[PDB]
Amino acid sequence: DTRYLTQHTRNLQPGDTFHALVEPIGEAPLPRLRLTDSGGKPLAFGLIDQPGESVELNYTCDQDICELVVHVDGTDGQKDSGEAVYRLLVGINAPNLS
């Protein structure tokens, strides 16, 4: 039913970082991760990591205010995958794997 997903993030302050990761918790196929602005215009790619199971993603705020929208693309996967689970790790300033 829901074959694509977004999450509207918090407003990042000028010169503030952002970290993101996807991991297939339910042995499902690998997804595309992306970061985009509040509109369509995109900021980044969630690259497939050295191990080859994690979708590592990075970005830092250069405009006056950054309001951000994480994408999780589920178009390349198992056909009608009843269960596909993912663990979405997202955070602002610490690269760790209140």
Binding site: R32, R34, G40, K41, A44, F45, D64, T75
Partner: protein, 176 residues
């Protein structure tokens, strides 16, 4: 400081070229390109001689790329190559504030058109955009990148002459 105004329409990312004859080394060119209507995300660039960006940018469109930062990388590389200086698609200072220091004497061309960006959150679907705009051009006039433009001195620029094919048919049915 000398300042000029221009308005126009971008029809699915094909831009408009403006000729700047006999510019002087050391001149500072200021360009501001703002959306006036439609969903156009403006793209401003400056060149020396004229070669058509629609061919090169059309190839970027064709890439349903690896994923988003692949587009950054590819657009960054193409823009840097095609223009001596460029500036982007929408944002805070409207859309295209671009300061360029003229490197040598001669004829220059500024290009006003579409970037390639995504519009939607339902799917990642990057395209050219369409719409009307206002272009503010400044010769040694810093107020142009401040978002304030008033026509100021002598004319130095105007519209530059290339063919674009589109054809169709359909069945017409007049009756009682």
């Amino acid at each position: 400081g000398r300042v000029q105004h221009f308005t126009g329409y971008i029809e699915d990312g094909r831009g408009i070229f403006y000729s700047l004859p006999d510019m002087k080394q050391g001149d500072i060119i200021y360009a501001s390109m703002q959306n006036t209507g439609g969903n156009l995300d403006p793209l401003v660039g400056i060149m020396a001689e004229e070669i058509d960006p629609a061919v090169s940018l059309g190839q970027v469109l064709e890439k349903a790329l690896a994923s988003e930062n692949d587009l950054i990388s590819e657009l960054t590389a193409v823009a840097d190559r095609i223009f001596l200086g460029w500036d982007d698609d929408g944002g805070k200072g409207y859309s295209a504030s671009l300061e360029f220091t003229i490197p040598r004497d001669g004829t220059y061309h500024i290009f006003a058109g579409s970037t390639i960006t995504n519009q939607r959150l339902d799917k990642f679907q990057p395209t050219y955009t369409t719409g009307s705009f206002q272009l503010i051009l400044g010769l040694n006039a810093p107020q142009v990148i401040s978002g304030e433009g008033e026509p100021e001195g002598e004319v130095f620029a105007s519209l530059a002459i290339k063919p674009e094919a589109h054809v169709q048919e359909l069945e017409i049915r007049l009756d009682k």
